[PDB]
Design a protein around this ligand. Sequence first.
Ligand code: HEM
Ligand code: HEM
Lengths: 452, 452
Amino acid sequence: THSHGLFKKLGIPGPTPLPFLGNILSYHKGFCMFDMECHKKYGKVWGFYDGQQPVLAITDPDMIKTVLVKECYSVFTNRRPFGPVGFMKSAISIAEDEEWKRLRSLLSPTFTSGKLKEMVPIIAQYGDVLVRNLRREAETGKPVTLKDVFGAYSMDVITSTSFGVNIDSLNNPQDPFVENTKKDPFFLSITVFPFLIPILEVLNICVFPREVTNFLRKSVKRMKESRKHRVDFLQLMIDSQNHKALSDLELVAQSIIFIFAGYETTSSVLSFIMYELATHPDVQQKLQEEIDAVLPNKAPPTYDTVLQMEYLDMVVNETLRLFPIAMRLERVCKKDVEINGMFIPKGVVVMIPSYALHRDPKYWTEPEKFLPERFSKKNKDNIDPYIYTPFGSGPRNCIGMRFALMNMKLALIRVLQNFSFKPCKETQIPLKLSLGGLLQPEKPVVLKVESR
Amino acid sequence: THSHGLFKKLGIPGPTPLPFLGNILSYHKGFCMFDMECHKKYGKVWGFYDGQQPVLAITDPDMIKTVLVKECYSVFTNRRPFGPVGFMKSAISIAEDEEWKRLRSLLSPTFTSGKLKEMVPIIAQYGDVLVRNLRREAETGKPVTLKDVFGAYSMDVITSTSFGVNIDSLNNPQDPFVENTKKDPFFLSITVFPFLIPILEVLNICVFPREVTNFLRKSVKRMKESRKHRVDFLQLMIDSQNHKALSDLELVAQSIIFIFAGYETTSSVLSFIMYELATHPDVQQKLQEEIDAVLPNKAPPTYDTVLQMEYLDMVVNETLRLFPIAMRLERVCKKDVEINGMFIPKGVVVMIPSYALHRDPKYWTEPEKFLPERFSKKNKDNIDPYIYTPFGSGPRNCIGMRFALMNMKLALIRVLQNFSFKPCKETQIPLKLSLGGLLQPEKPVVLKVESR
Ligand code: HEM
Ligand code: HEM
């Protein structure tokens, strides 16, 4: 109990921490359940301890605005340091202070709307590939695992948009990439034993499978040498090094982040969306009518076409409210500060419980209900942008927010143009969330697929 | 050999490091001998590795000026982090960045000439006490250990000027203070195992004898409560908390630093000075003549009197050239920079080899000779202030430089007013330096003392 007396010294409520462990035993219900219990019990501000690390949760939109936007460069610049990282410390989502600001500025032009519209014809090709794989498992006439067909699509999209490697992941069990790209009782121990991280670093024990990273460092340098080109993420970073220019090892670190970003997140949300569309056939029918109205006759989706669909944007936003895959937003307090009326000491991790704020009765009518009409152009104005934060906010929000929304909507249009999705006897209704550290279904979502 | 390829990648020469160990095996001759060998062999700039930590040594006065003075606040602000520190991280000599700048500004008024002249009558009382203890061991008629009588004087001076505790350390074997204040195969292991420092911190293993610190935290709070006052270091810090105000635990951290500063450093240099005066009776006679001229008839020394003696200042400066007790000046490179023509990467410890620069034939005639006339008002102008740095330089130099010079000279005047010092059969001539990490004699200095 070295630092376990900080929150009661500041008059901040919270759960009573145990020695060494802190409040990590309260994670037996999960990250999200623990935050909703504390928010319902302690109010707008409370504190807890991840081992010996003090964490302060805030729910006031003005205070959230000050942390994420106002005092981002001055006070709340970085996220919590995590376990044996290794060379991936040069990744943008992990880098800190000026090292991050240099990487953020070197990668911001990559995600502009100009580069994004140039990627529409690429990620539309795999939308047709996704329809092909779905047409097979539909005539199979038995429940289909969504995270597999969506995971393949998300893997095909991210490898083509970042390396130009066009594969059929579901039908090619092992093109090298597919396998290497296809690749807790340890993070909990790291949280209770944070002093062991320097030991794992000097032992080169990288959490990343060290038996994979080298495969990309040579694959990238092969593509560097071998390079009618081109519109992939690698090229936009190759043309950038032509602040201070990037490094070749820094180049590989950002490539790995975009994959874990463009894979698990895209496929998970797409699975949550299709679960809600299957469990609400009225919403699925209305969405298919808007798709057929904007794209008559199964016309191919375009950049300007995707942005025109309002109900599609309403369906995506509502699923992200129920399932914000990040769960929490976190910032480290770099110095003794005093924001919006309260004093924040140095070293405290300021956390925004995004999952709990998205299901708070103070801001949402029937929080557990899936109601896309919350985000209609009539009701969207009564939604605080610092309560609904699926992509974060401020200078360090999701840099691939526009790419994620465009990639998911392009798949949703091509999928719903040809198929309807019904629950199966195997479908878990209602959907239970994973008890662990990730925001994923307890049971993988399986649904019945029928051709239109 | 993780980072052992940095200096050859930058084209910087230096000794070839061994895996894990680096160049620490070359310390078998000592810090100072290793620096003089590298300076004679590699030139003005070289690099080595303390384990895995890269260290770059510089000898150019313009480059030294840029590190210590010009880019102090921007680039070179802190010193190397060292081993399990504990609560003493709040000490000024250990604090970093704004935490140090707040402590440096809160302790700068303590060492002004106004506070220093107010301490002359206090540390002159123990000058008479030092004459008394010397008069006994002189009539003993046998060699006298200088570091004991000087250590007692230095201990009596620092406890009275920082807590008002007036004791006779040599004749009181244990007033609590004396003992508690009287209080490597481990620093070497920490250098090779720097990842174990977080382990020693969570185990509360403080290198400082944890069985002593608590004695001061309650002694200070006793003096806080019990307090015709007063001119001690504690009061100047008590009146300061009446930036952001100091803390009571921060108060104890600075108190421990001033003791280790005002004890071992004052007594060691005083012993080096009396060794040179004994081995050079001509210098000792000329110094006694200047003392008797400025202070006729064994008159008591005053503040204005000490500053008038030029040859005394020449004797002190020349001994500090031969024996700069700090040995090295060190600064951590906070960011990628490019000083005076060369690029310095982030994380590199920039080191100024003070001992090697003080004995360099490029700037000193007969470097091994003790010649006080180097600092006469005629020859003092040809001495580069960034080659002769016994107290460092810049915004983070020795904050107690004026106190150290005044305290040592006050003892030298009262000692030389009554006694002359001759070598004994036990006196080590010439004096060998300690083979370890400290700058102290190999054998404790013993001399024959005779009353005038
Ligand atoms: C449904 C999909 C996604 C969601 C909901 C999402 C959400 C988020 C959130 C909440 C953050 C943290 C924001 C903050 O802390 O304020 C974040 C960070 C980030 N995201 Fe995403 N993301 C998604 C997909 C992607 C994709 C596809 C990419 C890249 C291709 C990406 C790249 C990043 C990066 C690089 C960061 C860190 C930015 C930085 O540290 O400067 N994300 N994302
Ligand atoms: C012969 C006696 C002394 C010598 C030769 C000496 C020398 C030095 C040197 C070389 C430094 C490092 C400067 C740098 O890195 O640029 C230093 C730092 C320091 N010294 Fe001394 N010193 C002596 C006595 C004292 C005394 C008596 C005190 C206090 C009563 C003291 C307090 C300090 C402090 C606090 C620092 C660190 C300053 C900071 O980090 O801001 N020293 N000293």
